[PDB]
């Protein structure tokens, strides 16, 4: 360390050039060659603005390089010519004559401009260079020279990484190392990151950036500089690409989303794009020389949690709040389980960031309430003005009620307005502490990079200790403040999450554990009877979690047998809702229809699952499916994964697979009439199954549940739970709906059917009850809040309000 | 009305300068009378062999009809009245197929009244049966009778 | 939310007619016809339908009644 | 330009009513450093302008928070 | 129908009449946005 990074890089550039052309003495021509890249190049500008036309200079300078000897191995870039060294050291003498704390590239041009006979002298040159109005005594790690195409349309990540500007990227050593490896390859050195949006592809790149600055990266990249390009257009683009090649691989270009400089073997590039977007790129044999794909897969919740904890600091600092670890876990979990759009890394963060935003919008909480009383005060404040002028002396001068109110309000106002100042102030210091508490962690890490553990110790002791506690007291000072724009918690997260789905009562509260234990209850709240089914399904799922089954399989797979309209689909639906907080988590495959190019029409399935990992998948009439499907299916039951059309497999490990069929129905019923032993039925029914299903299939089934006919009472129970909604609906109008047992029984009667089951009940309840009730409501007979009384009688149900 | 209006700007203008003085006599005393004076004359015309200061539905329905069709319906019929006579209206154009009408009618009535998920169409049906015996007709007639125009139909 | 969705088809037509000739119970027809439907429509679909209305053939009288209502426009236009 | 905050001051503007969110939202965006220039996106006739002139009235009444308390809204035509 | 010099002299003279004078343009905007100048037009469709 001693010279600015600018000039510093310029030297390395010249040095690498010497090597490339196989030279022995790093002479001036080398430094020139790299300094005079474009018309935009500072060396070019400054020089042209002084007089000497740079092009001719560069032109003639390269001529010399071409007229030099070709050495070998240990003689390449062996040393620095006396002339160069002399100029280099003369450049330092010129920086002191200007006050620049370092040697910039322009001060370096003067020196060389001196070591080069034929162009402008100090007098002319210092004047031109001076024509950039000060600002060169700045820092060394960044002189900030915005002249060249790269500096014009590109962000220098390695720079930010140098000044600790980049966010701490954590948990992607493997991907980084792979990227590093690829850059060293001779054949394919241009790695392209292939991944889904939000996964953290760019992170990988900037992560690598930081390592370079720390020397954490191997040789050959040790001094490299990573520049991120950011989308007559091609005029400048070329100005950039052609400027990176002149850097001589000493500068890696990173495109977040050509061949002439590439195929030529001089343009080191790092890409990043979608899977399918890269597949197309894999159609240009000249380009698709395999950019060394590096598929960045979406982090797991645990990893995501670590990542969030990493940036934990930054966010709560750049935004001034306190993000509890509790909330972090929520952002990762809740998103990964109920946010079908974006993918983990991203969405989890967006959640934390977006939940906090509302606390900012929550700043205008004072004015609102303060002014709310203000106006309200003026109301009575002006009202008195009328009661002060009395025509009723001993009847109007009794406004002691209104006058007292003014005082109170004048009090509450003086209260909150001054009380608010506390929060505001307590924040004032806090935000400052979090900043110095940062400037310290920056200062410390800094020292711990230059063994100056002197400071690294005096600070990590006492100093740091203070802030940490100071910025800890200030937070403890803002407990239940009227303006709590600090702690971000689960509720906050759950809320914004509920905003995209439904009920924080569950999203939040409910823990998989609590949920899985009450599972049989919940299910019964909607599915009447069929106890055997619930138990089996519930136990299978419980057995699934807890980790007692192969991780490479669906959470649970079942085959529902038995009659029709007696529970199967309902249970399937209810399961989806109760287990995945929504009936939207269901995915049906009406097999009885896919009797054609089935296979192809599902890799649709993969997609639904793809967007909603946690979901219940229902396959109706499984026997009707053709052997082809059973393969895709069987592939789900085993290894719990599936390869779609494109290729990228979808994960089914988090799904529940329910399959229905009526194969044993008749026999099952028969067994119930003749009332023979359940075991006798199951065995008899199994034989049948063995005639339409491959054993591999029947054997990979967690359970073979058998649904049975419903009992008169069961129906009634269904009628009740069925009425629930109507009620919850009529509730919106404060309208109550009480029915007679006779009424209920009537619905039960008409509702159920031997062969159709409880399918009819709905139509019945609709016609016999809802239709009439509707007419009364429209007619006005049933108003708001009324308690509608329903009873039987001739020709059907009868209604009565009150009376 | 002009005073009452001027008086309203008047007051509000005071509840800004805090001149509670003016604002006082205005809000209390001024506004009271003026508001009663106008309400007095208004009522003073509750009967007018040559006047009607009122703007009513008919008036609205009319200018609306002027941009569409028949005030007889636009006006007169209210959703309630309309939904109750629904089966009649439909039969004025659709002969027979009674089962169809009732079903559709009841569905729609059951729809309003709020007994169904708000996030659904007012009613969805599947017309089965022979050809040219009512289906499209009923569909057309429904559009007209329910939406005051056959222009409310959209075929696919 | 403010629209009415009508869907037509002839899937059960033949069977529906047959059920009327052999004059068997309406319920027997609806059920027989539904089965057919279950073969060309996803249950999710048939289940989200507010109603599955069945139109039937017209009677000589109705036809005359239609003639009348049909004549109406003519009367009107004249 | 037509000074809406002035027309509001004199009480010339008609009563905008029923748009607390949108207004408050604008009140918000009109204080955010990154993006403080709020654009109202909506169909013709919905009442976009009303929102603005509605906001105008609040300013004149002090109904608006701090930082806009004395501001003046000018409509360029 | 310096052009606008006289045009304004006209429009500003109609407003001083106080709506007691309706202006008719066979086949201006500014003194119409703030709110003033009673006008009756006539034109093809596209324009409007
Ligand atoms: N490994 C990580 N460490 C820290 N932050 C990360 C990490 N991965 C992703 N992020 C965050 O996620 C957002 C996008 O990260 P980025 O690495 O650019 O991913 P992306 O997949 O390229 N996005 P896109 O360009 O939209 O496809 C930023 O807010 C990051 O902070
Ligand atoms: N055990 C039950 N608990 C609650 N509701 C039930 C039950 N059994 C049947 N139902 C009702 O019957 C209808 C469908 O029930 P479901 O169990 O999904 O049968 P299905 O398999 O769809 N037969 P189908 O509709 O005839 O093709 C819904 O209206 C349910 O409310
Ligand atoms: N029930 C009915 N009442 C009055 N007119 C009817 C009736 N049924 C059929 N029609 C007449 O028949 C024609 C078409 O009737 P419609 O009910 O729309 O049948 P369709 O199934 O749509 N025929 P198409 O669309 O040609 O295949 C019209 O001219 C109607 O007047
Ligand atoms: N919230 C409101 N309160 C009172 N009047 C309103 C309201 N919103 C709209 N209006 C009225 O509706 C008409 C148009 O209002 P405006 O705010 O200009 O909406 P628009 O959709 O932006 N049309 P335009 O500005 O012409 O493109 C005016 O007559 C307004 O008075
Ligand atoms: Pt060479
Ligand atoms: Pt050196
Ligand atoms: Pt691009
Ligand atoms: Pt906000
Ligand atoms: Pt808000
Ligand atoms: Pt479902
Ligand atoms: Pt089938
Ligand atoms: Pt299928
Ligand atoms: Pt009267
Ligand atoms: Pt039509
Ligand atoms: Pt003109």
Short mmCIF file of N, CA, C and O in Angstrom, two decimals, chain A residues 606-640:
data_model
loop_
_atom_site.label_atom_id
_atom_site.label_comp_id
_atom_site.label_asym_id
_atom_site.label_seq_id
_atom_site.Cartn_x
_atom_site.Cartn_y
_atom_site.Cartn_z
N UNK A 606 -46.28 -31.33 -12.51
CA UNK A 606 -44.98 -30.85 -12.08
C UNK A 606 -44.98 -29.35 -11.79
O UNK A 606 -44.37 -28.90 -10.83
N UNK A 607 -45.66 -28.59 -12.64
CA UNK A 607 -45.74 -27.15 -12.48
C UNK A 607 -46.47 -26.73 -11.21
O UNK A 607 -45.95 -25.93 -10.42
N UNK A 608 -47.67 -27.27 -11.01
CA UNK A 608 -48.45 -26.95 -9.83
C UNK A 608 -47.61 -27.24 -8.60
O UNK A 608 -47.50 -26.41 -7.69
N UNK A 609 -47.00 -28.42 -8.58
CA UNK A 609 -46.14 -28.84 -7.48
C UNK A 609 -44.92 -27.93 -7.39
O UNK A 609 -44.45 -27.57 -6.31
N UNK A 610 -44.41 -27.57 -8.57
CA UNK A 610 -43.23 -26.72 -8.71
C UNK A 610 -43.44 -25.39 -8.00
O UNK A 610 -42.54 -24.91 -7.31
N UNK A 611 -44.62 -24.82 -8.15
CA UNK A 611 -44.93 -23.54 -7.53
C UNK A 611 -45.44 -23.70 -6.10
O UNK A 611 -45.36 -22.77 -5.30
N UNK A 612 -45.96 -24.88 -5.78
CA UNK A 612 -46.50 -25.15 -4.45
C UNK A 612 -46.01 -26.49 -3.94
O UNK A 612 -46.72 -27.49 -4.01
N UNK A 613 -44.78 -26.53 -3.40
CA UNK A 613 -44.19 -27.75 -2.87
C UNK A 613 -45.10 -28.43 -1.85
O UNK A 613 -45.39 -29.61 -1.96
N UNK A 614 -45.54 -27.66 -0.86
CA UNK A 614 -46.42 -28.19 0.16
C UNK A 614 -47.85 -28.20 -0.36
O UNK A 614 -48.53 -27.17 -0.35
N UNK A 615 -48.30 -29.36 -0.81
CA UNK A 615 -49.65 -29.47 -1.31
C UNK A 615 -50.15 -30.91 -1.32
O UNK A 615 -49.37 -31.86 -1.27
N UNK A 616 -51.47 -31.05 -1.36
CA UNK A 616 -52.11 -32.35 -1.40
C UNK A 616 -52.45 -32.61 -2.87
O UNK A 616 -53.03 -31.77 -3.54
N UNK A 617 -52.07 -33.78 -3.36
CA UNK A 617 -52.33 -34.13 -4.74
C UNK A 617 -53.32 -35.29 -4.79
O UNK A 617 -53.03 -36.39 -4.31
N UNK A 618 -54.48 -35.02 -5.37
CA UNK A 618 -55.54 -36.01 -5.46
C UNK A 618 -55.73 -36.59 -6.85
O UNK A 618 -56.00 -35.86 -7.80
N UNK A 619 -55.59 -37.91 -6.97
CA UNK A 619 -55.77 -38.59 -8.24
C UNK A 619 -57.09 -39.37 -8.18
O UNK A 619 -57.18 -40.37 -7.48
N UNK A 620 -58.09 -38.89 -8.91
CA UNK A 620 -59.41 -39.55 -8.93
C UNK A 620 -59.35 -40.81 -9.76
O UNK A 620 -58.50 -40.94 -10.64
N UNK A 621 -60.25 -41.75 -9.49
CA UNK A 621 -60.30 -43.01 -10.24
C UNK A 621 -58.92 -43.42 -10.76
O UNK A 621 -58.65 -43.31 -11.96
N UNK A 622 -58.06 -43.89 -9.87
CA UNK A 622 -56.72 -44.28 -10.26
C UNK A 622 -56.65 -45.46 -11.21
O UNK A 622 -55.78 -45.51 -12.08
N UNK A 623 -57.58 -46.41 -11.08
CA UNK A 623 -57.57 -47.59 -11.95
C UNK A 623 -57.73 -47.24 -13.42
O UNK A 623 -57.17 -47.91 -14.28
N UNK A 624 -58.48 -46.18 -13.71
CA UNK A 624 -58.69 -45.76 -15.08
C UNK A 624 -57.43 -45.24 -15.76
O UNK A 624 -57.36 -45.16 -16.99
N UNK A 625 -56.43 -44.88 -14.98
CA UNK A 625 -55.18 -44.39 -15.54
C UNK A 625 -54.48 -45.50 -16.30
O UNK A 625 -54.70 -46.68 -16.03
N UNK A 626 -53.63 -45.12 -17.25
CA UNK A 626 -52.90 -46.10 -18.03
C UNK A 626 -51.48 -46.29 -17.50
O UNK A 626 -50.87 -45.34 -17.01
N UNK A 627 -50.95 -47.52 -17.59
CA UNK A 627 -49.61 -47.88 -17.12
C UNK A 627 -48.59 -46.75 -17.21
O UNK A 627 -47.71 -46.62 -16.36
N UNK A 628 -48.72 -45.93 -18.25
CA UNK A 628 -47.83 -44.81 -18.45
C UNK A 628 -47.80 -43.90 -17.22
O UNK A 628 -46.74 -43.61 -16.68
N UNK A 629 -48.99 -43.48 -16.78
CA UNK A 629 -49.12 -42.60 -15.61
C UNK A 629 -48.55 -43.24 -14.35
O UNK A 629 -47.79 -42.60 -13.62
N UNK A 630 -48.92 -44.48 -14.08
CA UNK A 630 -48.42 -45.19 -12.91
C UNK A 630 -46.91 -45.05 -12.78
O UNK A 630 -46.37 -45.12 -11.68
N UNK A 631 -46.23 -44.87 -13.90
CA UNK A 631 -44.78 -44.71 -13.85
C UNK A 631 -44.45 -43.36 -13.24
O UNK A 631 -43.66 -43.28 -12.31
N UNK A 632 -45.06 -42.30 -13.76
CA UNK A 632 -44.81 -40.97 -13.22
C UNK A 632 -45.20 -41.01 -11.75
O UNK A 632 -44.47 -40.54 -10.89
N UNK A 633 -46.36 -41.60 -11.48
CA UNK A 633 -46.86 -41.71 -10.13
C UNK A 633 -45.87 -42.49 -9.28
O UNK A 633 -45.35 -41.99 -8.30
N UNK A 634 -45.62 -43.73 -9.68
CA UNK A 634 -44.70 -44.59 -8.95
C UNK A 634 -43.38 -43.88 -8.68
O UNK A 634 -42.76 -44.09 -7.64
N UNK A 635 -42.97 -43.04 -9.62
CA UNK A 635 -41.73 -42.31 -9.48
C UNK A 635 -41.87 -41.27 -8.38
O UNK A 635 -40.88 -40.83 -7.81
N UNK A 636 -43.11 -40.87 -8.11
CA UNK A 636 -43.37 -39.89 -7.06
C UNK A 636 -43.27 -40.62 -5.73
O UNK A 636 -42.60 -40.15 -4.81
N UNK A 637 -43.94 -41.77 -5.64
CA UNK A 637 -43.95 -42.58 -4.42
C UNK A 637 -42.56 -43.02 -4.00
O UNK A 637 -42.30 -43.20 -2.81
N UNK A 638 -41.68 -43.21 -4.97
CA UNK A 638 -40.30 -43.58 -4.68
C UNK A 638 -39.48 -42.31 -4.90
O UNK A 638 -39.88 -41.44 -5.67
N UNK A 639 -38.33 -42.21 -4.24
CA UNK A 639 -37.48 -41.03 -4.37
C UNK A 639 -38.18 -39.66 -4.26
O UNK A 639 -37.52 -38.62 -4.30
N UNK A 640 -39.50 -39.68 -4.12
CA UNK A 640 -40.27 -38.45 -3.97
C UNK A 640 -39.89 -37.27 -4.85
O UNK A 640 -39.99 -36.12 -4.44
#
